[PDB]
Amino acid sequence: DTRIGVTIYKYDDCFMSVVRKAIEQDAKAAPDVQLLMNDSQNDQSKQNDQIDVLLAKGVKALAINLVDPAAAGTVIEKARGQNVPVVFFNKEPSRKALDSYDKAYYVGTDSKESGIIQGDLIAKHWAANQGWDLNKDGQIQFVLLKGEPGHPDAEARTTYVIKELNDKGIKTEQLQLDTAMWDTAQAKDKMDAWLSGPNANKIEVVIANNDCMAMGAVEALKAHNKSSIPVFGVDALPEALALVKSGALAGTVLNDANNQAKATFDLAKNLADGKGAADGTNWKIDNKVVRVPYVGVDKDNLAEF
Numbered sequence: 052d053t054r055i056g057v058t059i060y061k062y063d064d065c066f067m068s069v070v071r072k073a074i075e076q077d078a079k080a081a082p083d084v085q086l087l088m089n090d091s092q093n094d095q096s097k098q099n100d101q102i103d104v105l106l107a108k109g110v111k112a113l114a115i116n117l118v119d120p121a122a123a124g125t126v127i128e129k130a131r132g133q134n135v136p137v138v139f140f141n142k143e144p145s146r147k148a149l150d151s152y153d154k155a156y157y158v159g160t161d162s163k164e165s166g167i168i169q170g171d172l173i174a175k176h177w178a179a180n181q182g183w184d185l186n187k188d189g190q191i192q193f194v195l196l197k198g199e200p201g202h203p204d205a206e207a208r209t210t211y212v213i214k215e216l217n218d219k220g221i222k223t224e225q226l227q228l229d230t231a232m233w234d235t236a237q238a239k240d241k242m243d244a245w246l247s248g249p250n251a252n253k254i255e256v257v258i259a260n261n262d263c264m265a266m267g268a269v270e271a272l273k274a275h276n277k278s279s280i281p282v283f284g285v286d287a288l289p290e291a292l293a294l295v296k297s298g299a300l301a302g303t304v305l306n307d308a309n310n311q312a313k314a315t316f317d318l319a320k321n322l323a324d325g326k327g328a329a330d331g332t333n334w335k336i337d338n339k340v341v342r343v344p345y346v347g348v349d350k351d352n353l354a355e356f
């Protein structure tokens with residue numbers, strides 16, 4: 052049997068819980084493979100110790116979902132000590148980090164694409180709902196709930212949702228922006244504060260970098276009887292799709308957990324076996340990276356998801 056060590060940055064991350072379960076399902080098809088699954092409990096120091104333990108247990112590959120993206124180098128040097136391949140997933144290392152070790156790979160997404168798609172969804176809905184322009188100034192007065200600072204998805208989704216709106220001719224005014232660290236409760240509390248402050252009446256649209264934060268905002272809006280304000284997310288979690296159906300969420304963007312899990316597993320297994328990373332698969336690896344497309348979702352195409 053081939054042992055592959057896997058770390059998930061925290062099992063209670065909504066999206067990574069989906070990915071974790073998918074990778075375990077994929078491991079069923081490989082009777083020759085054993086995954087050693089680790090919850091890093093949102094602590095890079097805990098993850099680092101877990102990786103040491105995995106390497107001591109003789110794993111032939113690592114699949115690592117970092118707590119801290121900047122810690123890729125640290126993790127690479129651990130893997131290098133055993134000359135073990137490492138497939139990073141979902142939190143993208145720098146190009147320099149990936150190039151520092153020939154056995155380091157990455158599976159994830161084109162982060163900017165999710166921001167562009169989200170911006171196009173907002174543009175569509177804004178044009179179709181001019182009642183959303185509460186102050187009739189032709190600009191979107193928005194608040195934005197950001198993911199972890201420095202996380203490539205948080206940075207790209209935040210930059211590109213606004214860039215895309217602006218590029219499409221829709222001016223925007225940032226009323227508030229803060230991180231809620233990908234978390235529902237923090238997002239709910241932050242949105243509630245914004246709704247309880249002076250100038251809460253100016254808020255026209257809520258933009259969240261993910262669905263779990265969007266869901267927290269939905270709950271805060273409900274508490275204030277402000278559900279007329281639209282909310283947009285990213286991931287297309289099942290719970291989020293149910294809120295698209297009910298009208299509580301205006302739109303989201305599928306982050307394809309199933310294919311990211313499958314690519315991570317396939318590459319890790321090949322690398323563990325000493326084969327080419329993409330051998331026997333149709334994955335297109337571009338300079339050691341696989342990116343899986345995002346797809347926008349709203350009521351108009353929900354039936355497809």
Ligand SMILES: OC[C@H]1O[C@@H](O)[C@H](O)[C@@H](O)[C@@H]1O
Nearest residue numbers: 064066141204233261286306
């Ligand atoms: O790294 C974890 C984060 O990954 C992102 O791609 C997802 O959209 C977030 O929901 C998740 O919290």
Ligand SMILES: [Ca+2]
Nearest residue numbers: 184188190192
């Ligand atoms: Ca306005």
